[PDB]
Write a protein that binds this ligand. Sequence first.
Ligand SMILES: O=C(O)[C@H]1CC[C@H](C(=O)O)CC1
Ligand SMILES: O=C(O)[C@H]1CC[C@H](C(=O)O)CC1
Ligand code: NA
Ligand code: NA
Lengths: 357, 359
Amino acid sequence: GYTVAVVGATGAVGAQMIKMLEESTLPIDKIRYLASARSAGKSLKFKDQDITIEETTETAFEGVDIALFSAGSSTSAKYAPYAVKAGVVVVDNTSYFRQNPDVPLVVPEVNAHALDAHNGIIACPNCSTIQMMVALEPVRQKWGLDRIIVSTYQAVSGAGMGAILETQRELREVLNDGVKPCDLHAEILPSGGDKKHYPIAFNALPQIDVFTDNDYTYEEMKMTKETKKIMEDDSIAVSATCVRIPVLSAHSESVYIETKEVAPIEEVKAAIAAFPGAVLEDDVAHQIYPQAINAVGSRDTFVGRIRKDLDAEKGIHMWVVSDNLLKGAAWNSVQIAETLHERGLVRPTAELKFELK
Amino acid sequence: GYTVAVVGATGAVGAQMIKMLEESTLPIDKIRYLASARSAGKSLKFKDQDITIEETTETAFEGVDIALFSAGSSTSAKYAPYAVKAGVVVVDNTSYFRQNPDVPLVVPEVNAHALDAHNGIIACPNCSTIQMMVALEPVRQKWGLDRIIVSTYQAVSGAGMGAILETQRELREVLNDGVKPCDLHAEILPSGGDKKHYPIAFNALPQIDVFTDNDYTYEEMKMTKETKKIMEDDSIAVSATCVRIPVLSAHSESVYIETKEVAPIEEVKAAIAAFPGAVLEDDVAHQIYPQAINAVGSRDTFVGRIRKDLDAEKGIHMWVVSDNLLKGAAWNSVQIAETLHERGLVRPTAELKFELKLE
Ligand SMILES: O=C(O)[C@H]1CC[C@H](C(=O)O)CC1
Ligand SMILES: O=C(O)[C@H]1CC[C@H](C(=O)O)CC1
Ligand code: NA
Ligand code: NA
C-alpha cells in the first residue's frame, strides 16, 4: 500500500479529500495530514484513527507515495517541487501548474491518457471547467465542438471555508437582524485577495477571482484555457461569465454550444447519459432537471434542460450541475490518484522539471 | 386630475405601484385600490389617506381614467376589457395581452411611439425583457442586433408575495433550525401553477413559468417574442435560459449579443451611459459592476462587465441588473401612465377591440 499525504487537510476541499479517501479503493498503509504551522499538533479523524496534523515544509515529504494538494497556489508553488524531488506523485487542486506543458491537466473520463507521461505533478482543473468537460466531451466525440458560451452560478464553498461562514453570517444578519443586504459588511467575497469586498447575501456577484488585462476575470479565462488544454484543441472558442450566487455547495452552469455537425437532441441526451460521470436528469414533462441542492454529496455531474437553439442550426443549450468540492475538487483528485494506481503510474519521477522555491 | 385604480394593490407589485404613484408627477384626484374578495374591506394607505380595498368586478371601473393591473393574467383577461368598455386606459403588467396586435407592448425609452395608436390597453413586458431592452436598445440603434443569448438570475419577488415569504421561511429553516435544503417543503416555487414544487434556498432552479411544447419555458419564450415585438424586428434571434436564484428583489442577466456592425466596447459603454434609464456601472479596475443588492429601490437599469467575445468579432458580453418590481413592473407601468399623460393619450377608446369574458 501507499503513504498518502493530504496538504490542506483542514480546509473545505481538504475535508472532502479526507471523505473521498475514506471512501476510496486506494490501498493506503499510512495517511498523513498536512497544513500550516497553526494547525500542527491538532487531530483529525481518518475513519476511526486519530491523525495528528503536521506543518507543511520542504522536508515533510520523505516516504510519501502520493500527495494531494489543496492548500492554495502559494503552497503548491513552494512545496510541490520538493515533494517531486522526494519521489512523490503530486495531484494538485490549485491553478499554479495547470498551464505548465510538463503538467497533465486531467479529468479522468476525458483525458486519462495524459497521465501516462506525467513528470510528478498532475493538475486538477477548476471546478467550473471540470463539470463542463464531463457534460460536453460525449457531445464533442460524436459531433465536435466549435464554440462554447457559458454563464455560471457558482457556490461560495469554492472560495474556501471562510466564504461559507461569511455567507451564513450575512444571511442571518438580514433574516434575523433586519439588516439591508446593501448595508452588510464583507471581508472575503467576491475575491479574498482583491481590494474591495461585497455582500453575497441576496446578491449575484459577477466576479470570481481577480480581473485580468482583458476585462475577463481569471476564473473566466481559466474556463477558456483549461477547456482548450483538456480537450487538446485550441480551436474551440470559449467565452465565460462567472458569477457567485448565494449557494453553499454545487455549481450550476447555463452552457451554450455550437457543434461541428448537427447533433440530434435525443442522440445528445443519450450520449450524455452513456458517458461515465455524467447523469442525464432531463424530463421536463415532470419538471426534472439538475438542481444544486440535489447534486450535493454526489460524485456525478448532472445534465438537463437540453434543447436546440431557436435559430442557430448547430446550437444547443443545457444546464450542468455538480458538487464543486467533489467532482469539482476532491473527487476529481482522488479519482486521478485511483487512475494513477490502475495504470501503474505511482512511482518517483527521475528527471526534475520543476524549479525548487 | 385623474381617477386612478390599482388592480392588485395588495400584492408584491401592487405595493410598489402604490409607492411609484405616491412619487409620481401624475395629477391624481382620486385613488382606488382593487383586489380580490380576499382583501376587500381591508385598508391600505395612499400617502396619509386610508383607502378601502374593493373587490374587482366588471362594474368597478365607472369614473376611472387610468387602471394599473397587476393581479395575474386571469384578472386582466376577465376585467381589463370591461375597464376599456367603461372608458378607462389600462396599463397591464400581465402577459395576457402582450402579443395582441391591437396592444402596444411598451418600454417608454424604447418604443413610446407605439402608445399613440393604443386601443385602451397598453401592456408592460415581463421584467426580464424590460431591463434587457433598456440595456440593448442604445446598442441596436448604432450597430444593430443580429442575435441575443441570455441567461438570467431572477429574484423570487417576481413570483409574488407568497414566493417571497416561502424563500424567507426556507432560509430561516436552514440557517436557524439546521434543516438540510433537500429536506425543505415548498408550495409555490418554481411555478405556482405547475405540478411539483422545489426549494429555492441555496438552490438555482432553471424553471420560470411552465414548460412549452419546444422544451423552453414560457418565461424564456416571452423574452424571445417580446424582444421581437418591442424592437419591431422579427429577425433578431433570441434564445434564453431563465433561472430563479435565492434573491428577493432585482434580476440580473448575463447577456450575449452579436451586433450587425462591429461595436467598439468603449463606444458601447458610452452609448449605454447616454441612454435614458440605463446607467453604466463598469470600472473593473475598482471592481465596479451592477449588483442586485445595489439596484433595489432604483428605477434605473444598471449595465457593466461589458467586453468583447474572445473569438466572435461582433460578439459582446455584459451584465444587466434592475429592480424587478420597479423598472421590471411598477415603475414601467407608472412611467407609461406619465407618458400617456404627456402625450394627451388618457381618454376613452370608442371602439372595443377586446372580447368580454363575463357575459
Ligand atoms: O481552482 C481554482 O483555480 C479556483 C479556486 C477558487 C474557486 C472559487 O473561488 O470558487 C474558483 C477556482
Ligand atoms: O410577467 C410575466 O409574464 C411573468 C410573471 C411572473 C414573473 C416571475 O415569476 O418572476 C416572470 C414574468
Ligand atoms: Na453516464
Ligand atoms: Na438576426
